[PDB]
Amino acid sequence: QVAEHWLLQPLPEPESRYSFWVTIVTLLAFAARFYKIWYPKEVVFDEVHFGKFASYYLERSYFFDVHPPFAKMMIAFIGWLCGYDGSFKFDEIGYSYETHPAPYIAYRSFNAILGTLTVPIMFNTLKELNFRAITCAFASLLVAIDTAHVTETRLILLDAILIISIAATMYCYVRFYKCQLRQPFTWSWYIWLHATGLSLSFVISTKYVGVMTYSAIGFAAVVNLWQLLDIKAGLSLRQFMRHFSKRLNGLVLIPFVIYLFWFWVHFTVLNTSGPGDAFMSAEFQETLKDSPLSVDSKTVNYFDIITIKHQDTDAFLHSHLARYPQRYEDGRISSAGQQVTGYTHPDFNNQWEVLPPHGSDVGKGQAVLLNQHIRLRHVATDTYLLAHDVASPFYPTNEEITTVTLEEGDGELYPETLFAFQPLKKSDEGHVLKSKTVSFRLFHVDTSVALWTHNDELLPDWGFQQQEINGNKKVIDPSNNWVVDEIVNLDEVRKVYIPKVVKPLPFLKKWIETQKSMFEHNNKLSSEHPFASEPYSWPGSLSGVSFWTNGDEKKQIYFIGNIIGWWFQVISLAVFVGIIVADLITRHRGYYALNKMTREKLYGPLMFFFVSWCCHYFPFFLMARQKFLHHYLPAHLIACLFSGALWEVIFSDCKSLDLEKDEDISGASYERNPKVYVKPYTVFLVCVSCAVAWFFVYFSPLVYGDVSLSPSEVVSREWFDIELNFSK
């Protein structure tokens, strides 16, 4: 069998040396991932997607995504362990975790644990392939201190769960293969077969790129089944069929059941209507409960008395008979008009009647539509809401919000009383306004400002320590968002809620529909992200991706590989192809340069990793969808194992005993324990490790985002197609 004599050898070193080196490289990996894990205190890159999906799992709100559910459910499960409710939505990059406390440190720590645990799995994979402890240490170090693997595995991303599942798959398959070489159908053989299947299931249940890991293990499993089919293997056809049926069960059938199990959990957790509904059929949507918000949601009509609540501060739009001071503390002149403030408690001064524009044919009981002109009458003071070209108390650029008498507001000031419930999305213009479910900006028509409030500073004693309400000129700002909370004057007929009768759908029908939608949307979504990259640029790490930027501090996170480490792997792949071509040419000439044991290393573990790298790299040249550098991290992970292994072989006594005799011929004498030139090999590995570590330290400001770089220091890190922020 492939590399049978090599893989059945005892370990080349005592276990204490392996335990020493695995501990050191795991501690380095831990230090690199947990360094400043609380920073930045803001949403970074795709945390906007995976944090948001974690929130929807906790709320039980149905969402659609192009990837399978397992890794998102693992993130959500950490939130659930922290008692997080899903309130924070991760809507944009740069959103502060201080205003709405998501357990972001716990999520980042979970990924940092998985990224750290990848390193000892990689180490133990080479240990089980009978490589030296220093070789295992070096290959694992190339992942422990790679800038791309570090950046991805400390943020709230799926790739930490993907990469550990790929590492576990490679390790479990190597363990299975050693059990297969020693004694097939042992209890240990079954454990490792099903552990390979389980790990393969987690790979494909995280991202569909996991098919490349199935292809790599599938190829190796087929090659070994081909050797067991040979008459020279001494197996009966019944014994071969026993191998085939058990591997089919352990590597295909059981992993497929575990893959379906994650969709069954996903549909059982997500039992409420949500943002995913638009991607599914009406029959699927009938399986979802109404949202708690939709149950209480009532259409807002003209002449309804409403309370309007701010989304970020929970404050109600409020007014009372007190007036703005004739001058603010900075000496600016106010209108001396009636105060409009943000009040956090429900009272009679939160009540606004929604009135149509003057001269409209719109009667009582007609629904208010989004982006229609309206007037708001304060019920307690009998005044119209007004905004004008007077500056607000705290913000000189924002407008003071006040109220005017009915006579003046029906006279010359009529334009200044016109508001609209402006939708957050232009697609939602002309939809019916509903309480609790429809967010809007309260937009002033004449001056083109949105009503806004804040809770970092409260009005002085003359404003009763209430929140300021002002006209923000940055209309698109997400902090300008309001909702109608209650309709106070709701008719008894409009109070009656009719619950939707949930209709059951068979699980396989539900799964087939979602799966078709997943593949159809993954194939579409054509776009031009200022960071898409083609497969030919990945092994060189020629371009990267901006993950986060802070303009005030001139700080940034940039996703890029350790270029010294990546180029060392490209050289390693090229050298190996050269060695294989040279071995094939020399053998075809009757010249047997390489010892049998060197060939078992080359055509066994090194060829297994080389083909596994090919499976994770070349299929991307056949993909016409958008691609990104992170898609190469599975291939880079395998290239780290490969490069460590290759250089041990190069620094071994590779010579055949007799250059005219093929040592592969049965009964030929060959050297069973080729000497590794440990001294020059260790010096070589230390030199490469020091260069990779130097690069990691030099790029560490861009991995962590924690240090501001001068423009000259930014430009010194710009090479090839690396564009960095703050180079000017």
């Binding site: 997607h49 776009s527 200022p530 930027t549 958008q626 922020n725 703050f726």
Partner: peptide, 16 residues
Amino acid sequence: TSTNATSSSCATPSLK
């Protein structure tokens, strides 16, 4: 408004 250096730190799309 100073023009941006790298287009902008943005996310990957998830369809409609």
